[PDB]
Design a protein around this ligand. Sequence first.
Ligand SMILES: COc1cc(OC)c(Cl)c(-n2c(-c3ccccc3)cc(=O)c(C)c2-c2ccc(F)cc2)c1
Ligand SMILES: Nc1nc2c(ncn2[C@@H]2O[C@H](COP(=O)(O)OP(=O)(O)OP(=O)(O)O)[C@@H](O)[C@H]2O)c(=O)[nH]1
Ligand SMILES: Nc1ncnc2c1ncn2[C@@H]1O[C@H](COP(=O)(O)OP(=O)(O)CP(=O)(O)O)[C@@H](O)[C@H]1O
Ligand SMILES: COc1cc2c(c(OC)c1OC)-c1ccc(OC)c(=O)cc1[C@@H](NC(C)=O)CC2
Ligand SMILES: Nc1nc2c(ncn2[C@@H]2O[C@H](COP(=O)(O)OP(=O)(O)O)[C@@H](O)[C@H]2O)c(=O)[nH]1
Ligand SMILES: [Ca+2]
Ligand SMILES: [Ca+2]
Ligand SMILES: [Ca+2]
Ligand SMILES: [Ca+2]
Ligand SMILES: [Mg+2]
Ligand SMILES: [Mg+2]
Lengths: 351, 418, 438, 54
Amino acid sequence: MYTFVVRDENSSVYAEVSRLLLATGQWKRLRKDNPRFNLMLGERNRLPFGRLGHEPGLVQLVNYYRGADKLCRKASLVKLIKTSPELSESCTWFPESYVIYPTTDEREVFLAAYNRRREGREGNVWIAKSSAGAKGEGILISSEASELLDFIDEQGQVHVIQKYLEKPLLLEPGHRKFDIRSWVLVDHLYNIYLYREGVLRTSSEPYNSANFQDKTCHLTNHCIQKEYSKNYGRYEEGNEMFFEEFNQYLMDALNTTLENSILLQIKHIIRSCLMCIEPAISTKHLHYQSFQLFGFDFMVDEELKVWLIEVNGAPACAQKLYAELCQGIVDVAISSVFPLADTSIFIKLHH
Amino acid sequence: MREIVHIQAGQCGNQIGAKFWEVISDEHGIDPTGSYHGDSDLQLERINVYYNEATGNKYVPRAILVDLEPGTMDSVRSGPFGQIFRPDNFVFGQSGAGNNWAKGHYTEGAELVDSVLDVVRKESESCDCLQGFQLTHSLGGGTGSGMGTLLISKIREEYPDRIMNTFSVMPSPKVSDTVVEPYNATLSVHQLVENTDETYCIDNEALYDICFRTLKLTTPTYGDLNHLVSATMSGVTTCLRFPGQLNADLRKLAVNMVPFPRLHFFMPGFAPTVPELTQQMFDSKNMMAACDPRHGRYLTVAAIFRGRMSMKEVDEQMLNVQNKNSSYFVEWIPNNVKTAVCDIPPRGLKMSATFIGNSTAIQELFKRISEQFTAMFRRKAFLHWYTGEGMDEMEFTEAESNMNDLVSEYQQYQDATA
Amino acid sequence: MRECISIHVGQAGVQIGNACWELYCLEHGIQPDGQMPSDKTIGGGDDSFNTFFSETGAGKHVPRAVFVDLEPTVIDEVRTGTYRQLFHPEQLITGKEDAANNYARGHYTIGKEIIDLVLDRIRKLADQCTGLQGFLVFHSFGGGTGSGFTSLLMERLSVDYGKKSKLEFSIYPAPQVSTAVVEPYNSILTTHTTLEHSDCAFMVDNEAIYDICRRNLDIERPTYTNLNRLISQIVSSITASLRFDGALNVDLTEFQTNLVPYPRIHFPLATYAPVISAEKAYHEQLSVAEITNACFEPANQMVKCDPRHGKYMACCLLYRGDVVPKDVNAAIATIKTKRSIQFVDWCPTGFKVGINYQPPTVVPGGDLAKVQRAVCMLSNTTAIAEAWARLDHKFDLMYAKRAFVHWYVGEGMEEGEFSEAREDMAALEKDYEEVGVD
Amino acid sequence: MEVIELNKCTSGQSFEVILKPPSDPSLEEIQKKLEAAEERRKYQEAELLKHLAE
Ligand SMILES: COc1cc(OC)c(Cl)c(-n2c(-c3ccccc3)cc(=O)c(C)c2-c2ccc(F)cc2)c1
Ligand SMILES: Nc1nc2c(ncn2[C@@H]2O[C@H](COP(=O)(O)OP(=O)(O)OP(=O)(O)O)[C@@H](O)[C@H]2O)c(=O)[nH]1
Ligand SMILES: Nc1ncnc2c1ncn2[C@@H]1O[C@H](COP(=O)(O)OP(=O)(O)CP(=O)(O)O)[C@@H](O)[C@H]1O
Ligand SMILES: COc1cc2c(c(OC)c1OC)-c1ccc(OC)c(=O)cc1[C@@H](NC(C)=O)CC2
Ligand SMILES: Nc1nc2c(ncn2[C@@H]2O[C@H](COP(=O)(O)OP(=O)(O)O)[C@@H](O)[C@H]2O)c(=O)[nH]1
Ligand SMILES: [Ca+2]
Ligand SMILES: [Ca+2]
Ligand SMILES: [Ca+2]
Ligand SMILES: [Ca+2]
Ligand SMILES: [Mg+2]
Ligand SMILES: [Mg+2]
């Protein structure tokens, strides 16, 4: 049989597939520091990549791509998009963003943008966020550049200012905001697998253009919704609308489909991002192999244009979908390298 | 030119050692008269390790034969390879030891010990670069145990910087023919723990089971058991006696096999497709010491394969055993299983494998002897035979304490984690 | 003409030393007896190949080399090998019993007893030198002699030849190729003691050499002969600039000025291409761009690591054979676009190139195929620190439980030296991280 | 992206290609360390022989 290790003990997704592998009866779990493993479910921070692919007679697999942080960090992502010809600074599916260092900084660049929109009386609502922000906190929306920079100085970690989508697609009934989460698996061959089932993560408070103080109607993190949202769960169970219902809503309310209006743009963004970094992280010729599951976050505006907002290299699945997705990771990302003894759920995004 | 001085003491030591010289003499192609009549020059490239080159191109073992009872000397001298040995290297008494450790260690053996060291000085001074000593002996008797460890203590005084190896037949859990063996064994172990770099634990009950249950000998004898032990002794010393990809001595073996100075008691094995040997070799049924490897963890392991065989096949099979049953290996000694190969197989065999394991499970053996020792010592049973030779009860208490401390040490690293 | 003395310490250094001097003789046409018909200047000369060879009035070209080992098994073969006539017996020093894989035994116990003799024999060769440059030291990280005695010699060389340069060719231990449980200890101790005395050190991981041999040469179980012959090719290409006319890496001092802006980070990664099996029927000749691209494939490096996740501080390309500057420059341009090559902001993104028109040489009956163009790339990338972390982690596992420490203490070392040297490696690992990671 | 420092000889030639511009102990100290180690070995051996003498 095969052997594996678990080093992210707080990983919801990989806690379950650790049980899946054992259930097969052709795998076994060693402890963190035993080096004779075929698979590693590594830690989120400072994974020891340099120690893999050196044990004689052991093909080794790891559940993380060395270098994917360049895409899953708010500061890195903005720099990666602006400096990569593939994506470029004029990228259209990524909101106008600028990296800001409190106390390689683009303060005066964003200051030239806000003033330009002041002359033309254009929308000037911006949002400041950072990877340091946790639990749905550390993010402030304002149309006053002065307020944003000041808030970023009280904070310590690097911050980024992003053009706020003042015109999001609003679901009815509710007149409410949402974001889309797509789960993407990249195997050792670097095939890009998009999970068929996504989820809309919904705000249960009508989108209020007037005041951004009430961030329950502007921030759609399930985390915050349970905290300070009265209407939680009124429409869909746990503010989680799924593709079958949303597709029906698009048909009934806008005479379109989820595939054409939105999903086609989603697949293009996923490929563009992942292909941009393939030369840097590909393990096709490495002494060890890598796979990794990502979570892409999207925003849809009223014109049914798709925007990318964040990328998660250690994402959490939806409770209803853990069983199916985790089983797919084994079939596609693990059993492919370590066959067991003698229909698809993913959408393969072509090279 | 890294010569080894062989010493064998007591019946067991001499019977086992005598069969050992028969085995390697055939491997180096040396006849009873001591003249070479072999085929390959690889038999001689490193022959000076265990043999002195005498006038007339006769080969004489660097062997010293010791006992307090002359009977076993005469058996050796009249055996198949009796006339190989140097006449002056028979150092024997007339009294015997009477299964009494004190007689062998303090009185009867003390009278004869100097004569044995004089023969050691002859052999050692005739060595280009003395490497170390190896001793074959039982621990349950009085001469090999009592006088054997006395010889070890004296050798360490003259040669403190040399390696001391021993092949010690240990008391078996159920088969015994000596009532006082727990006393003799415990007193010897406390000596071995201090003055030996490597000790191979040999158990006669396990050897008998192999001869009976496996080899299918309906009437096993000490000759059959000695053949197995000699076959293992040859397998252990294969790298010291033959050239190959490995150029290593006894000190290197000790440096890499012993992570802690007191825990130097090894568990030997022997086997008998390449996959099937490695399967046998790690089996409890093939272990020469009466301790289950599955009841512990290997600190270090050494495997030696002999005979024309696919090297890559052995490497893959060994690596499979490590990865397959990795829960029986300490995780904090990286790559603690090393393998060596020699092209020369033994007589009447095409492929063979020898096993050397430093397993924490060996504490089970020291537990047994301690409990047997305490049951007798609490009531001072048979003790008057030892105090009559001048021993004091405190010397018995010390040995009990040390072997329990040794048992305590083994349990420490059997549960240690990274 | 400035001379270069080679010192080979232990089994690995000696056996590699032979493969190197075997190849040197073929590349220069020197016969096993020491007489090369190609030489017109008898009994001396200021030729570039004299940097590694001295001349005698009889026509023998004597290598400027010293072999040293604490036991005579390995060097005895030298004394009776095909090239026995090549060195005067004095250049071959042997002890009685080895260091037994114990860094302390080779450094303290036995090193003190033989250091004076070795330095005298080195000084005998230095007296035959008019403009001695420095020393090239071949040794293993794992052996007791290779690790223990070498660190002692490097300390004394920094004393007796303070101004002179010292280069290391170090064999990094690999489980696949006959290691010992305590080699991580020896490798860390000898690095710590030798770090301040080594101007530039080229590590060679037996794992990488093993896999290259087993994959590109179709050798199921590589032997030390297979690895050493391949190792000699990389060494020869690295030292060719010293033995042939040229304007690149002509002086030992130039090696670190072109490869090492930071004193402590002096471990350049070597990559070699092409490695072709002679058993290969009629291997199609490769191109300049193809072999130059192979210099960035991790499978060709001497140390398996990922330079894409480090930063470069210097890069050199050493071509042997039919290579024109136009093809090299074209190949570089194309692969800057494809490969991930990030230099430190305080260094220029450049490549120092060198071409020697003589095609690579192959030993008769050797496993390497006679190719027409070959390249060796030397790059100081922070990714080589992956090797230190691997070694340091193994060190940590054992030292936490003090396994085998008693063997070193028994020879006169203190446990403090274990922690002192590990602390030094923790700093080296951290130094690499500051340079090569944001 | 220019070629500079080109040098040619009949044995070979060398040059550089810039794709982008940028943005010890003394002897006695040694022997004291070796002598301190020798004293430690001697003290260790003395304790052994002392215990063996007892
Ligand atoms: C160790 O204590 C023994 C107890 C015993 O009977 C209780 C016996 Cl028979 C033997 N023994 C003897 C022997 C010894 C002393 C007097 C008479 C005969 C000769 C012989 O050739 C063999 C092979 C064995 C032997 C060894 C290990 C076993 F597991 C089983 C039998 C040994
Ligand atoms: N590439 C290569 N590596 C070798 C060779 N010989 C030994 N090694 C490596 O060296 C290590 C063993 O130490 P050695 O250098 O042989 O020992 P030593 O230098 O003679 O020192 P001692 O311990 O005294 O014998 C192992 O890790 C091997 O991988 C060789 O011929 N070629
Ligand atoms: N440019 C923009 N315009 C409008 N809303 C935005 C926005 N950027 C972010 N948001 C809102 O902020 C919420 C969280 O933003 P962000 O992605 O920075 O937080 P986060 O990184 O903690 C989510 P996760 O934990 O899944 O990675 C989203 O649900 C989204 O509705
Ligand atoms: C007698 O000659 C031997 C000498 C040694 C070894 C050995 O077992 C294979 C021998 O044969 C019995 C040895 C065993 C211990 C180790 O593994 C834990 C190690 O790393 C070290 C090994 C040997 N090293 C190698 C690369 O085989 C050196 C010590
Ligand atoms: N393998 C083997 N073991 C023996 C032999 N003779 C005795 N023994 C063991 O040694 C013990 C008896 O000790 P003995 O050899 O007489 O020791 P001595 O008094 O020093 O000669 C028994 O318990 C046996 O286990 C023998 O010929 N072969
Ligand atoms: Ca008397
Ligand atoms: Ca005397
Ligand atoms: Ca000349
Ligand atoms: Ca210096
Ligand atoms: Mg996030
Ligand atoms: Mg050696």
